[PDB]
Each structure stands twice: as structure tokens, then as C-alpha cells.
Amino acid sequence: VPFVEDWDLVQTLGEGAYGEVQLAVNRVTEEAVAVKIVDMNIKKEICILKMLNHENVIKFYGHRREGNIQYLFMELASGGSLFDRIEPDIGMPEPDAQRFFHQLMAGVVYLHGIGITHRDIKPHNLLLDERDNLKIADYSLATVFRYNNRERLLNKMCGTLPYVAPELLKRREFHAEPVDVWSCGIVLTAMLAGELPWDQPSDSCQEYSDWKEKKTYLNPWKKIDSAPLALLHKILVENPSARITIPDIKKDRWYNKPLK
Ligand SMILES: CN(C)c1ncnc2nc[nH]c12
Ligand SMILES: [Cl-]
């Protein structure tokens, strides 16, 4: 079994483009963490990771260079991902979706508050701890959109097409926060319907045209109760300046509904 200083690398949790993530167990003390292995953009990632301190964001423990391998030591989420809690074509019980959505908003308010955009919110990047607490993971696409209290517009296109906001396909430059809000709306759809609404929010996508024409008698919308669906009407708004902000999501009727 491979090892790093005091830790044993004992199994693969994830295989992504950006290296492997391993379960690491201190042989002495028995503490289990996760270790991202990069065979060396990473200067920046580690800088953002060291900023992160919130119960709904993956904590960064530190890194070691060992030749051309960088090791990034991070909080372990032993509950797997939100992706594995979503039943295809069904989703999950509304009260569980609501709790995960509450946690996802707490995490995203946190990141936006330290001027960080995640840029790839999707169920594979939302991990669960042993108590099913949600942790926003993977800061490999994350970037600074606010510094010294001044906003910078983004112009890099990145993310995952079914989760990306339409302005990202159409505008030369756009605001960071409404793109992350949109991807949370697609995550909420996936949790309540167990299906993604469209391949991408482009005019050439029939499913996206159908939503803009308010055909909510179609899937996935017909599986979603009127209350969460009215919130999805405010989140999945094509014009990012008309799109609901997180302060106004927090005042939404479904957001505040007591559930099982
Ligand atoms: C799958 N994967 C990337 C991970 N699994 C468990 N805990 C983690 N902490 C950071 N990434 C983790
Ligand atoms: Cl899905």
C-alpha cells in the first residue's frame, strides 16, 4: 500500500481529470482524511483552498510536494456525493431536497462572501459527511471575482453544460454570482425530478425553449410541486440581472416551508 509521510493511501474515492483522490489513514492516530494526488493553476487552487473555513465547504488541511507529485490534504466526506442520493426519474423526498438546498445556499453565501466563485456546482461536487451534511468540493475551477471590495467580471467559459447559465454561452463577460445561483437551480431540479431539464440553455435546445415558453406540463417540471417550482421560476431566469439573488431566495415561500 502506498504512503505519504505519516499517512497510508488505502483506496480511491474519486478518479477525475485533475488526478486521483485517496482515503489517507494516519497509521499511528487512525485519523482518516482525503488526499488529492496531482502529477505536476495549482498555485491558485491551493491559495483558494487555504481561504476556506465553513461547515458546508470542504476544509483544506495542507499540502506536500514529493518530486512531481503534489498531495492536497482535505476534509473527508464519508457519505459519498449528492449524485448517489438522487434516484433517476424520481429525485428524492422534498424535505431531504430542501435540507440539502439550505446547506448548499449556506456554502455558496460563504464562498460569495469571501469573493470566491466555484463555477462547477453539480451533484458530483456536493459531498456528504457521516451525518449527511453537504460539503461543496473541488476548487479546481474556482476563481476570485471580488478583491479589495471590487468585483471583476468573468470571461472564461467553464463548468458543465447542463448546469451552466445561458449568459456564459452568450456574453463576452458576465457576473460570477448569478452563474453559481443558476447551477444551484439545476441541482434543485435534479433533486426533485431525478432528471436534468436540458443539454444546455441555448436557443437551439428545444427543452430550454419549452421552459422559456412556460410549458411546465412537460417533464421534469410536472414532477415538481407548485411551491419549489415557483422558486425554480425565479432562479432559472435567462437575464442574469432579473434572476433572483440569494438574499431573495432566503425569503422564498418554499425555502421557508416547514417539511417532514
Ligand atoms: C470523491 N471525493 C473527491 C472525495 N470523497 C470524499 N471526501 C473528499 N474530500 C475531498 N474530496 C473528497
Ligand atoms: Cl440527475
Side-chain angles (χ1 to χ4, degrees), residues 130-177:
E130 47 299 336
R131 304 253 274 179
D132 272 2
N133 295 131
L134 176 142
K135 264 67 153 75
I136 305 164
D138 198 330
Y139 288 80
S140 81
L141 289 184
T143 197
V144 162
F145 72 98
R146 201 199 300 106
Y147 194 84
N148 287 155
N149 204 45
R150 258 289 214 147
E151 189 175 5
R152 28 185 98 176
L153 298 188
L154 305 179
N155 64 251
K156 180 197 199 289
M157 279 198 266
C158 56
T160 304
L161 275 169
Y163 293 91
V164 291
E167 58 270 28
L168 180 147
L169 305 175
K170 294 165 203 45
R171 290 189 182 191
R172 291 184 340 83
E173 285 175 298
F174 50 84
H175 289 280
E177 286 171 288

mmCIF file of all heavy atoms in Angstrom, residues 130-177:
data_model
loop_
_atom_site.group_PDB
_atom_site.id
_atom_site.type_symbol
_atom_site.label_atom_id
_atom_site.label_comp_id
_atom_site.label_asym_id
_atom_site.label_seq_id
_atom_site.Cartn_x
_atom_site.Cartn_y
_atom_site.Cartn_z
ATOM 1 N N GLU A 130 -20.664 12.092 7.451
ATOM 2 C CA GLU A 130 -21.287 10.870 8.057
ATOM 3 C C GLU A 130 -22.710 11.201 8.517
ATOM 4 O O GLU A 130 -23.533 10.274 8.564
ATOM 5 C CB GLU A 130 -20.426 10.252 9.175
ATOM 6 C CG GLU A 130 -19.880 11.239 10.194
ATOM 7 C CD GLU A 130 -18.958 12.320 9.634
ATOM 8 O OE1 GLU A 130 -18.338 12.100 8.547
ATOM 9 O OE2 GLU A 130 -18.892 13.413 10.259
ATOM 10 N N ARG A 131 -22.994 12.477 8.798
ATOM 11 C CA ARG A 131 -24.325 12.983 9.227
ATOM 12 C C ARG A 131 -25.112 13.580 8.046
ATOM 13 O O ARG A 131 -26.110 14.277 8.297
ATOM 14 C CB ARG A 131 -24.114 14.026 10.324
ATOM 15 C CG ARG A 131 -23.309 13.515 11.509
ATOM 16 C CD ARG A 131 -24.183 13.295 12.725
ATOM 17 N NE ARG A 131 -24.354 14.511 13.510
ATOM 18 C CZ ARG A 131 -25.086 14.606 14.620
ATOM 19 N NH1 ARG A 131 -25.735 13.555 15.093
ATOM 20 N NH2 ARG A 131 -25.169 15.760 15.258
ATOM 21 N N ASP A 132 -24.728 13.286 6.802
ATOM 22 C CA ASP A 132 -25.439 13.777 5.590
ATOM 23 C C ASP A 132 -25.420 15.309 5.532
ATOM 24 O O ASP A 132 -26.364 15.900 4.977
ATOM 25 C CB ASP A 132 -26.896 13.328 5.603
ATOM 26 C CG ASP A 132 -27.096 11.985 4.981
ATOM 27 O OD1 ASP A 132 -26.092 11.390 4.573
ATOM 28 O OD2 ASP A 132 -28.263 11.588 4.885
ATOM 29 N N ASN A 133 -24.417 15.927 6.127
ATOM 30 C CA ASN A 133 -24.150 17.353 5.866
ATOM 31 C C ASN A 133 -23.475 17.498 4.504
ATOM 32 O O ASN A 133 -22.544 16.737 4.175
ATOM 33 C CB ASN A 133 -23.339 18.015 6.959
ATOM 34 C CG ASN A 133 -24.104 18.038 8.259
ATOM 35 O OD1 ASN A 133 -23.554 17.660 9.278
ATOM 36 N ND2 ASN A 133 -25.358 18.458 8.245
ATOM 37 N N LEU A 134 -23.921 18.516 3.780
ATOM 38 C CA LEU A 134 -23.427 18.817 2.422
ATOM 39 C C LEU A 134 -22.151 19.652 2.524
ATOM 40 O O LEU A 134 -22.090 20.584 3.324
ATOM 41 C CB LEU A 134 -24.514 19.546 1.648
ATOM 42 C CG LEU A 134 -24.140 20.020 0.254
ATOM 43 C CD1 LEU A 134 -25.327 19.841 -0.667
ATOM 44 C CD2 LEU A 134 -23.685 21.479 0.269
ATOM 45 N N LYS A 135 -21.184 19.320 1.680
ATOM 46 C CA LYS A 135 -19.866 19.986 1.604
ATOM 47 C C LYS A 135 -19.653 20.287 0.122
ATOM 48 O O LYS A 135 -19.673 19.339 -0.701
ATOM 49 C CB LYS A 135 -18.800 19.044 2.203
ATOM 50 C CG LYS A 135 -18.404 19.249 3.671
ATOM 51 C CD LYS A 135 -19.425 18.974 4.690
ATOM 52 C CE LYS A 135 -18.878 18.561 6.048
ATOM 53 N NZ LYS A 135 -18.309 19.670 6.841
ATOM 54 N N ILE A 136 -19.484 21.545 -0.229
ATOM 55 C CA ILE A 136 -19.088 21.933 -1.609
ATOM 56 C C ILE A 136 -17.581 21.607 -1.771
ATOM 57 O O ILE A 136 -16.735 22.140 -1.001
ATOM 58 C CB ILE A 136 -19.402 23.414 -1.916
ATOM 59 C CG1 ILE A 136 -20.875 23.776 -1.684
ATOM 60 C CG2 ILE A 136 -19.051 23.685 -3.374
ATOM 61 C CD1 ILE A 136 -21.145 25.235 -1.607
ATOM 62 N N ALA A 137 -17.281 20.747 -2.738
ATOM 63 C CA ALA A 137 -15.950 20.191 -3.046
ATOM 64 C C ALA A 137 -15.479 20.623 -4.434
ATOM 65 O O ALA A 137 -16.313 20.989 -5.307
ATOM 66 C CB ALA A 137 -16.030 18.690 -2.948
ATOM 67 N N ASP A 138 -14.181 20.426 -4.665
ATOM 68 C CA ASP A 138 -13.462 20.586 -5.947
ATOM 69 C C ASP A 138 -13.310 22.071 -6.289
ATOM 70 O O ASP A 138 -14.226 22.647 -6.899
ATOM 71 C CB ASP A 138 -14.090 19.792 -7.090
ATOM 72 C CG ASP A 138 -13.093 19.629 -8.235
ATOM 73 O OD1 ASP A 138 -12.247 20.525 -8.410
ATOM 74 O OD2 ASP A 138 -13.189 18.645 -8.980
ATOM 75 N N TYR A 139 -12.141 22.651 -5.993
ATOM 76 C CA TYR A 139 -11.883 24.101 -6.198
ATOM 77 C C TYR A 139 -10.948 24.281 -7.369
ATOM 78 O O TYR A 139 -10.448 25.407 -7.542
ATOM 79 C CB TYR A 139 -11.466 24.754 -4.890
ATOM 80 C CG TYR A 139 -12.659 24.838 -3.991
ATOM 81 C CD1 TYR A 139 -13.033 23.715 -3.304
ATOM 82 C CD2 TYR A 139 -13.493 25.958 -3.955
ATOM 83 C CE1 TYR A 139 -14.139 23.726 -2.473
ATOM 84 C CE2 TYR A 139 -14.631 25.979 -3.152
ATOM 85 C CZ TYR A 139 -14.959 24.843 -2.431
ATOM 86 O OH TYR A 139 -16.080 24.733 -1.662
ATOM 87 N N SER A 140 -10.896 23.265 -8.230
ATOM 88 C CA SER A 140 -10.017 23.254 -9.410
ATOM 89 C C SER A 140 -10.505 24.267 -10.450
ATOM 90 O O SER A 140 -9.647 24.744 -11.168
ATOM 91 C CB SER A 140 -9.837 21.856 -9.936
ATOM 92 O OG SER A 140 -10.926 21.451 -10.731
ATOM 93 N N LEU A 141 -11.788 24.675 -10.484
ATOM 94 C CA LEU A 141 -12.231 25.723 -11.442
ATOM 95 C C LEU A 141 -12.507 27.042 -10.705
ATOM 96 O O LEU A 141 -12.827 28.046 -11.391
ATOM 97 C CB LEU A 141 -13.468 25.251 -12.202
ATOM 98 C CG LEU A 141 -13.271 24.147 -13.236
ATOM 99 C CD1 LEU A 141 -14.589 23.912 -13.941
ATOM 100 C CD2 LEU A 141 -12.201 24.524 -14.261
ATOM 101 N N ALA A 142 -12.398 27.050 -9.376
ATOM 102 C CA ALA A 142 -12.819 28.198 -8.540
ATOM 103 C C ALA A 142 -11.944 29.388 -8.919
ATOM 104 O O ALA A 142 -10.837 29.153 -9.442
ATOM 105 C CB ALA A 142 -12.718 27.883 -7.072
ATOM 106 N N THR A 143 -12.439 30.601 -8.745
ATOM 107 C CA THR A 143 -11.679 31.838 -9.023
ATOM 108 C C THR A 143 -12.193 32.984 -8.161
ATOM 109 O O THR A 143 -13.259 32.862 -7.479
ATOM 110 C CB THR A 143 -11.683 32.169 -10.516
ATOM 111 O OG1 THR A 143 -10.626 33.099 -10.699
ATOM 112 C CG2 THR A 143 -12.938 32.794 -11.057
ATOM 113 N N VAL A 144 -11.394 34.037 -8.102
ATOM 114 C CA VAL A 144 -11.696 35.242 -7.303
ATOM 115 C C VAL A 144 -12.543 36.131 -8.192
ATOM 116 O O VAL A 144 -12.137 36.382 -9.292
ATOM 117 C CB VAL A 144 -10.398 35.966 -6.881
ATOM 118 C CG1 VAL A 144 -10.674 37.398 -6.471
ATOM 119 C CG2 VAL A 144 -9.650 35.205 -5.782
ATOM 120 N N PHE A 145 -13.697 36.585 -7.745
ATOM 121 C CA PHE A 145 -14.495 37.545 -8.528
ATOM 122 C C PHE A 145 -14.575 38.875 -7.773
ATOM 123 O O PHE A 145 -15.156 39.790 -8.360
ATOM 124 C CB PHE A 145 -15.900 37.007 -8.816
ATOM 125 C CG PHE A 145 -16.827 36.965 -7.644
ATOM 126 C CD1 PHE A 145 -17.742 37.982 -7.440
ATOM 127 C CD2 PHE A 145 -16.817 35.888 -6.772
ATOM 128 C CE1 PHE A 145 -18.597 37.956 -6.350
ATOM 129 C CE2 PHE A 145 -17.695 35.856 -5.703
ATOM 130 C CZ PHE A 145 -18.555 36.896 -5.471
ATOM 131 N N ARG A 146 -14.160 38.923 -6.503
ATOM 132 C CA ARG A 146 -14.181 40.174 -5.683
ATOM 133 C C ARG A 146 -12.889 40.250 -4.887
ATOM 134 O O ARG A 146 -12.512 39.262 -4.230
ATOM 135 C CB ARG A 146 -15.414 40.256 -4.774
ATOM 136 C CG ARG A 146 -15.755 41.686 -4.326
ATOM 137 C CD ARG A 146 -16.649 41.785 -3.107
ATOM 138 N NE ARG A 146 -17.947 41.132 -3.328
ATOM 139 C CZ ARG A 146 -18.330 39.961 -2.805
ATOM 140 N NH1 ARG A 146 -17.523 39.250 -2.029
ATOM 141 N NH2 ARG A 146 -19.543 39.516 -3.068
ATOM 142 N N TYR A 147 -12.185 41.389 -4.977
ATOM 143 C CA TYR A 147 -10.929 41.575 -4.230
ATOM 144 C C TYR A 147 -10.816 43.051 -3.904
ATOM 145 O O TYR A 147 -11.174 43.848 -4.804
ATOM 146 C CB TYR A 147 -9.744 41.114 -5.088
ATOM 147 C CG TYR A 147 -8.464 40.948 -4.331
ATOM 148 C CD1 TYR A 147 -8.183 39.781 -3.655
ATOM 149 C CD2 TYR A 147 -7.524 41.981 -4.276
ATOM 150 C CE1 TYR A 147 -7.037 39.637 -2.892
ATOM 151 C CE2 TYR A 147 -6.345 41.832 -3.568
ATOM 152 C CZ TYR A 147 -6.101 40.661 -2.869
ATOM 153 O OH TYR A 147 -4.966 40.506 -2.145
ATOM 154 N N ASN A 148 -10.424 43.356 -2.668
ATOM 155 C CA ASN A 148 -10.406 44.748 -2.147
ATOM 156 C C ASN A 148 -11.764 45.389 -2.398
ATOM 157 O O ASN A 148 -11.818 46.576 -2.796
ATOM 158 C CB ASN A 148 -9.278 45.524 -2.843
ATOM 159 C CG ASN A 148 -7.935 45.089 -2.324
ATOM 160 O OD1 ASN A 148 -6.907 45.214 -3.001
ATOM 161 N ND2 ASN A 148 -7.928 44.619 -1.094
ATOM 162 N N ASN A 149 -12.820 44.587 -2.280
ATOM 163 C CA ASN A 149 -14.224 45.046 -2.384
ATOM 164 C C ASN A 149 -14.574 45.510 -3.809
ATOM 165 O O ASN A 149 -15.599 46.147 -3.944
ATOM 166 C CB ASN A 149 -14.514 46.117 -1.323
ATOM 167 C CG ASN A 149 -15.989 46.185 -0.988
ATOM 168 O OD1 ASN A 149 -16.640 45.152 -0.802
ATOM 169 N ND2 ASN A 149 -16.540 47.388 -1.001
ATOM 170 N N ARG A 150 -13.804 45.145 -4.845
ATOM 171 C CA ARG A 150 -14.129 45.453 -6.255
ATOM 172 C C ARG A 150 -14.411 44.157 -7.011
ATOM 173 O O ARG A 150 -13.583 43.211 -6.967
ATOM 174 C CB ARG A 150 -12.977 46.167 -6.960
ATOM 175 C CG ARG A 150 -13.209 47.661 -7.085
ATOM 176 C CD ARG A 150 -14.279 48.046 -8.085
ATOM 177 N NE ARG A 150 -13.782 49.295 -8.607
ATOM 178 C CZ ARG A 150 -13.933 49.756 -9.847
ATOM 179 N NH1 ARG A 150 -14.664 49.078 -10.722
ATOM 180 N NH2 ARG A 150 -13.333 50.897 -10.198
ATOM 181 N N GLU A 151 -15.532 44.144 -7.699
ATOM 182 C CA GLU A 151 -15.977 42.969 -8.471
ATOM 183 C C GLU A 151 -15.166 42.930 -9.759
ATOM 184 O O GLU A 151 -14.989 43.990 -10.364
ATOM 185 C CB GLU A 151 -17.472 43.084 -8.757
ATOM 186 C CG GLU A 151 -18.025 41.815 -9.347
ATOM 187 C CD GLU A 151 -19.523 41.724 -9.576
ATOM 188 O OE1 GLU A 151 -20.260 42.724 -9.362
ATOM 189 O OE2 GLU A 151 -19.933 40.687 -10.074
ATOM 190 N N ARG A 152 -14.730 41.758 -10.208
ATOM 191 C CA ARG A 152 -14.312 41.607 -11.621
ATOM 192 C C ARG A 152 -15.280 40.655 -12.318
ATOM 193 O O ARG A 152 -15.612 39.594 -11.747
ATOM 194 C CB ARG A 152 -12.872 41.121 -11.724
ATOM 195 C CG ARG A 152 -12.385 40.295 -10.551
ATOM 196 C CD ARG A 152 -10.905 39.989 -10.715
ATOM 197 N NE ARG A 152 -10.133 40.937 -9.937
ATOM 198 C CZ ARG A 152 -8.814 40.922 -9.785
ATOM 199 N NH1 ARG A 152 -8.088 39.990 -10.379
ATOM 200 N NH2 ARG A 152 -8.242 41.845 -9.026
ATOM 201 N N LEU A 153 -15.699 41.029 -13.508
ATOM 202 C CA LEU A 153 -16.488 40.160 -14.419
ATOM 203 C C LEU A 153 -15.635 38.978 -14.847
ATOM 204 O O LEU A 153 -14.411 39.074 -14.902
ATOM 205 C CB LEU A 153 -16.945 41.007 -15.610
ATOM 206 C CG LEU A 153 -17.860 42.176 -15.227
ATOM 207 C CD1 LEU A 153 -18.432 42.864 -16.467
ATOM 208 C CD2 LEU A 153 -18.973 41.708 -14.301
ATOM 209 N N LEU A 154 -16.270 37.844 -15.093
ATOM 210 C CA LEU A 154 -15.578 36.659 -15.645
ATOM 211 C C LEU A 154 -15.716 36.691 -17.163
ATOM 212 O O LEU A 154 -16.701 37.236 -17.655
ATOM 213 C CB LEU A 154 -16.267 35.409 -15.090
ATOM 214 C CG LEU A 154 -16.358 35.342 -13.576
ATOM 215 C CD1 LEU A 154 -17.082 34.064 -13.184
ATOM 216 C CD2 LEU A 154 -14.999 35.389 -12.934
ATOM 217 N N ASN A 155 -14.794 36.067 -17.879
ATOM 218 C CA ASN A 155 -14.936 35.837 -19.340
ATOM 219 C C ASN A 155 -14.547 34.394 -19.721
ATOM 220 O O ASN A 155 -14.901 33.955 -20.809
ATOM 221 C CB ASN A 155 -14.112 36.875 -20.087
ATOM 222 C CG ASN A 155 -12.659 36.676 -19.756
ATOM 223 O OD1 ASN A 155 -12.066 37.479 -19.047
ATOM 224 N ND2 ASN A 155 -12.133 35.537 -20.166
ATOM 225 N N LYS A 156 -13.875 33.640 -18.865
ATOM 226 C CA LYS A 156 -13.597 32.214 -19.156
ATOM 227 C C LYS A 156 -14.941 31.458 -19.156
ATOM 228 O O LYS A 156 -15.734 31.640 -18.244
ATOM 229 C CB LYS A 156 -12.560 31.724 -18.145
ATOM 230 C CG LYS A 156 -12.106 30.270 -18.229
ATOM 231 C CD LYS A 156 -11.400 29.846 -16.920
ATOM 232 C CE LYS A 156 -10.522 28.613 -17.028
ATOM 233 N NZ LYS A 156 -11.325 27.378 -17.193
ATOM 234 N N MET A 157 -15.230 30.707 -20.211
ATOM 235 C CA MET A 157 -16.330 29.718 -20.201
ATOM 236 C C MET A 157 -15.813 28.448 -19.525
ATOM 237 O O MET A 157 -14.834 27.857 -20.031
ATOM 238 C CB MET A 157 -16.763 29.395 -21.627
ATOM 239 C CG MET A 157 -17.683 30.404 -22.180
ATOM 240 S SD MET A 157 -18.508 29.690 -23.570
ATOM 241 C CE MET A 157 -17.418 30.280 -24.860
ATOM 242 N N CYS A 158 -16.431 28.019 -18.424
ATOM 243 C CA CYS A 158 -16.137 26.683 -17.859
ATOM 244 C C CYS A 158 -17.339 26.192 -17.070
ATOM 245 O O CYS A 158 -18.299 26.908 -16.974
ATOM 246 C CB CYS A 158 -14.906 26.721 -16.966
ATOM 247 S SG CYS A 158 -15.058 27.942 -15.638
ATOM 248 N N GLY A 159 -17.269 24.972 -16.587
ATOM 249 C CA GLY A 159 -18.383 24.322 -15.902
ATOM 250 C C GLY A 159 -18.798 23.083 -16.653
ATOM 251 O O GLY A 159 -17.937 22.440 -17.313
ATOM 252 N N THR A 160 -20.082 22.746 -16.554
ATOM 253 C CA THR A 160 -20.678 21.505 -17.097
ATOM 254 C C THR A 160 -21.939 21.921 -17.825
ATOM 255 O O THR A 160 -22.761 22.544 -17.182
ATOM 256 C CB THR A 160 -20.886 20.495 -15.970
ATOM 257 O OG1 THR A 160 -19.621 20.290 -15.338
ATOM 258 C CG2 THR A 160 -21.413 19.181 -16.478
ATOM 259 N N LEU A 161 -22.062 21.661 -19.138
ATOM 260 C CA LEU A 161 -23.085 22.344 -19.988
ATOM 261 C C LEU A 161 -24.500 22.299 -19.402
ATOM 262 O O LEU A 161 -25.217 23.308 -19.435
ATOM 263 C CB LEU A 161 -23.042 21.743 -21.411
ATOM 264 C CG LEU A 161 -21.995 22.354 -22.337
ATOM 265 C CD1 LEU A 161 -21.882 21.495 -23.604
ATOM 266 C CD2 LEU A 161 -22.323 23.826 -22.627
ATOM 267 N N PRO A 162 -25.008 21.161 -18.889
ATOM 268 C CA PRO A 162 -26.365 21.118 -18.366
ATOM 269 C C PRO A 162 -26.609 22.012 -17.124
ATOM 270 O O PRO A 162 -27.765 22.437 -16.859
ATOM 271 C CB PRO A 162 -26.541 19.632 -17.985
ATOM 272 C CG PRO A 162 -25.497 18.915 -18.746
ATOM 273 C CD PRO A 162 -24.343 19.858 -18.858
ATOM 274 N N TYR A 163 -25.526 22.375 -16.457
ATOM 275 C CA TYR A 163 -25.558 23.204 -15.231
ATOM 276 C C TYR A 163 -25.231 24.662 -15.539
ATOM 277 O O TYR A 163 -25.364 25.508 -14.607
ATOM 278 C CB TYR A 163 -24.583 22.629 -14.229
ATOM 279 C CG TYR A 163 -25.036 21.288 -13.748
ATOM 280 C CD1 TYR A 163 -24.631 20.131 -14.390
ATOM 281 C CD2 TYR A 163 -25.955 21.186 -12.721
ATOM 282 C CE1 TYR A 163 -25.053 18.885 -13.957
ATOM 283 C CE2 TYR A 163 -26.378 19.948 -12.282
ATOM 284 C CZ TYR A 163 -25.942 18.801 -12.918
ATOM 285 O OH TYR A 163 -26.352 17.552 -12.502
ATOM 286 N N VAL A 164 -24.745 24.997 -16.742
ATOM 287 C CA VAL A 164 -24.226 26.392 -16.944
ATOM 288 C C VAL A 164 -25.379 27.328 -17.250
ATOM 289 O O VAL A 164 -26.366 26.949 -17.881
ATOM 290 C CB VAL A 164 -23.157 26.575 -18.051
ATOM 291 C CG1 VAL A 164 -21.836 25.933 -17.720
ATOM 292 C CG2 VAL A 164 -23.673 26.144 -19.397
ATOM 293 N N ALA A 165 -25.201 28.581 -16.858
ATOM 294 C CA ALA A 165 -26.187 29.642 -17.081
ATOM 295 C C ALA A 165 -26.061 30.104 -18.516
ATOM 296 O O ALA A 165 -24.968 30.088 -19.062
ATOM 297 C CB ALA A 165 -25.986 30.794 -16.132
ATOM 298 N N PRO A 166 -27.172 30.554 -19.128
ATOM 299 C CA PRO A 166 -27.170 30.911 -20.545
ATOM 300 C C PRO A 166 -26.250 32.087 -20.897
ATOM 301 O O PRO A 166 -25.721 32.062 -22.009
ATOM 302 C CB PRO A 166 -28.622 31.262 -20.843
ATOM 303 C CG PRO A 166 -29.252 31.533 -19.477
ATOM 304 C CD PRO A 166 -28.472 30.701 -18.487
ATOM 305 N N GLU A 167 -25.995 33.003 -19.943
ATOM 306 C CA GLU A 167 -25.159 34.199 -20.206
ATOM 307 C C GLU A 167 -23.736 33.737 -20.508
ATOM 308 O O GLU A 167 -22.991 34.473 -21.245
ATOM 309 C CB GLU A 167 -25.135 35.240 -19.078
ATOM 310 C CG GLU A 167 -24.646 34.753 -17.704
ATOM 311 C CD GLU A 167 -25.743 34.212 -16.816
ATOM 312 O OE1 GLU A 167 -26.741 33.718 -17.383
ATOM 313 O OE2 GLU A 167 -25.628 34.302 -15.571
ATOM 314 N N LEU A 168 -23.342 32.588 -19.954
ATOM 315 C CA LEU A 168 -21.973 32.071 -20.099
ATOM 316 C C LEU A 168 -21.748 31.622 -21.553
ATOM 317 O O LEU A 168 -20.615 31.800 -22.082
ATOM 318 C CB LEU A 168 -21.789 30.960 -19.060
ATOM 319 C CG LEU A 168 -20.424 30.316 -19.059
ATOM 320 C CD1 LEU A 168 -20.005 29.896 -17.676
ATOM 321 C CD2 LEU A 168 -20.437 29.120 -19.991
ATOM 322 N N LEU A 169 -22.809 31.197 -22.237
ATOM 323 C CA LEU A 169 -22.736 30.821 -23.667
ATOM 324 C C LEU A 169 -22.908 32.055 -24.566
ATOM 325 O O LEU A 169 -22.653 31.912 -25.765
ATOM 326 C CB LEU A 169 -23.847 29.819 -23.981
ATOM 327 C CG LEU A 169 -23.877 28.565 -23.126
ATOM 328 C CD1 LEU A 169 -25.096 27.744 -23.469
ATOM 329 C CD2 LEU A 169 -22.623 27.759 -23.324
ATOM 330 N N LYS A 170 -23.418 33.182 -24.066
ATOM 331 C CA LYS A 170 -23.906 34.266 -24.960
ATOM 332 C C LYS A 170 -23.141 35.571 -24.753
ATOM 333 O O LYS A 170 -23.183 36.398 -25.665
ATOM 334 C CB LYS A 170 -25.388 34.553 -24.746
ATOM 335 C CG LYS A 170 -26.306 33.417 -25.155
ATOM 336 C CD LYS A 170 -27.735 33.542 -24.621
ATOM 337 C CE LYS A 170 -28.447 32.205 -24.548
ATOM 338 N NZ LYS A 170 -27.579 31.140 -23.970
ATOM 339 N N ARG A 171 -22.507 35.784 -23.604
ATOM 340 C CA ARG A 171 -21.920 37.101 -23.261
ATOM 341 C C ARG A 171 -20.412 36.972 -23.266
ATOM 342 O O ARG A 171 -19.914 35.877 -22.991
ATOM 343 C CB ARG A 171 -22.422 37.577 -21.905
ATOM 344 C CG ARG A 171 -23.888 37.960 -21.932
ATOM 345 C CD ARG A 171 -24.283 38.623 -20.643
ATOM 346 N NE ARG A 171 -25.707 38.950 -20.634
ATOM 347 C CZ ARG A 171 -26.283 39.720 -19.727
ATOM 348 N NH1 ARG A 171 -25.557 40.250 -18.754
ATOM 349 N NH2 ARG A 171 -27.584 39.943 -19.785
ATOM 350 N N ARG A 172 -19.725 38.049 -23.626
ATOM 351 C CA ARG A 172 -18.250 38.102 -23.619
ATOM 352 C C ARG A 172 -17.795 38.150 -22.169
ATOM 353 O O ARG A 172 -16.727 37.610 -21.866
ATOM 354 C CB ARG A 172 -17.764 39.307 -24.447
ATOM 355 C CG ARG A 172 -18.025 39.143 -25.947
ATOM 356 C CD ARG A 172 -17.503 40.220 -26.898
ATOM 357 N NE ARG A 172 -17.240 41.467 -26.189
ATOM 358 C CZ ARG A 172 -16.120 41.731 -25.519
ATOM 359 N NH1 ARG A 172 -15.140 40.839 -25.485
ATOM 360 N NH2 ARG A 172 -15.989 42.884 -24.884
ATOM 361 N N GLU A 173 -18.560 38.826 -21.316
ATOM 362 C CA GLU A 173 -18.251 38.993 -19.870
ATOM 363 C C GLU A 173 -19.549 38.916 -19.074
ATOM 364 O O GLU A 173 -20.577 39.415 -19.524
ATOM 365 C CB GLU A 173 -17.563 40.333 -19.553
ATOM 366 C CG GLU A 173 -16.114 40.372 -19.960
ATOM 367 C CD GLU A 173 -15.497 41.741 -19.737
ATOM 368 O OE1 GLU A 173 -15.991 42.671 -20.381
ATOM 369 O OE2 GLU A 173 -14.572 41.877 -18.882
ATOM 370 N N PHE A 174 -19.469 38.360 -17.877
ATOM 371 C CA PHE A 174 -20.666 38.171 -17.031
ATOM 372 C C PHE A 174 -20.262 38.157 -15.551
ATOM 373 O O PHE A 174 -19.088 37.857 -15.207
ATOM 374 C CB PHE A 174 -21.346 36.893 -17.541
ATOM 375 C CG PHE A 174 -20.373 35.736 -17.657
ATOM 376 C CD1 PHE A 174 -20.064 34.945 -16.549
ATOM 377 C CD2 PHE A 174 -19.795 35.420 -18.877
ATOM 378 C CE1 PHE A 174 -19.171 33.880 -16.658
ATOM 379 C CE2 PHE A 174 -18.910 34.353 -18.987
ATOM 380 C CZ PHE A 174 -18.612 33.578 -17.881
ATOM 381 N N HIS A 175 -21.253 38.441 -14.707
ATOM 382 C CA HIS A 175 -21.184 38.371 -13.236
ATOM 383 C C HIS A 175 -21.077 36.918 -12.760
ATOM 384 O O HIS A 175 -21.865 36.106 -13.232
ATOM 385 C CB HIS A 175 -22.395 39.122 -12.669
ATOM 386 C CG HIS A 175 -22.313 40.608 -12.840
ATOM 387 N ND1 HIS A 175 -21.545 41.427 -11.997
ATOM 388 C CD2 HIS A 175 -22.928 41.440 -13.723
ATOM 389 C CE1 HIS A 175 -21.691 42.691 -12.378
ATOM 390 N NE2 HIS A 175 -22.529 42.735 -13.418
ATOM 391 N N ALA A 176 -20.196 36.669 -11.790
ATOM 392 C CA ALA A 176 -19.949 35.334 -11.206
ATOM 393 C C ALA A 176 -21.178 34.818 -10.434
ATOM 394 O O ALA A 176 -21.548 33.640 -10.589
ATOM 395 C CB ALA A 176 -18.725 35.425 -10.344
ATOM 396 N N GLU A 177 -21.775 35.639 -9.577
ATOM 397 C CA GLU A 177 -22.744 35.132 -8.561
ATOM 398 C C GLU A 177 -23.993 34.552 -9.243
ATOM 399 O O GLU A 177 -24.445 33.465 -8.897
ATOM 400 C CB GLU A 177 -23.028 36.257 -7.577
ATOM 401 C CG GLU A 177 -21.879 36.512 -6.612
ATOM 402 C CD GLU A 177 -22.158 37.781 -5.840
ATOM 403 O OE1 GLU A 177 -22.068 38.885 -6.461
ATOM 404 O OE2 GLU A 177 -22.552 37.648 -4.687
#
